[PDB]
Amino acid sequence: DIQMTQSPSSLSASVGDRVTITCQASQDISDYLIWYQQKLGKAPNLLIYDASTLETGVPSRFSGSGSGTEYTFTISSLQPEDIATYYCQQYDDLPYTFGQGTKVEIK
Template sequence: MVQVKALPVLFCAMGLLSETLCSLTLEAEVGDKVTIWCQHDLTNTGYIFWFKQIIGSVPLIMGCKKFRTSAPSVACHFFTESERIVMSVHDKNTSLTITAVNVSDTGLYYCSYSEKMIFSNSTSLQVKGC
């Protein structure tokens, strides 16, 4: 089961809390479904990325979408999406949903947006299991 305080997560997703207050730690059990939220302030076309980083390793791109104000977001042409890890983009936030988490999903997740790679809040995910 995912353990997280719902009200702060809701406020973070709505953009009502500052990004420093939105850094979270999620705990999940193997097999759980987890959704991580991140704010963005794009008003023009730009890219939104999700990264995962573990200690001693370079960040891995977990998701990428091209944000467009006049049309739905589209996947980045250089990134192949996963069926288990799904990225969604909304007007002021983005989410990364991981179904059937496993221990290898443990790490620090954060998003970045625009051409200048502005990094937003991070979430540490700890998956417990055998």
């Protein structure tokens, strides 16, 4: 069972800031990682797949990189609309596991 550890568990930054979030797998998951955004009271929405491919329609201010067991999610310039909780999930094998999630706030 692949353990996903995400950090930090939460942060607050200002509009325009560069935000960064990490997820480490307990095994090489061969780049099968997704980043999801979950707005308060809504279902998670896929942002990035294959570690670094943006889903069609996602703003380019969003980006992911990494490989092996360490992955990185970055938001190059924070918008008020990005206030949500972010999650990484491994899809290298079942059961698909999630990171603990990172709440992103403004201020």
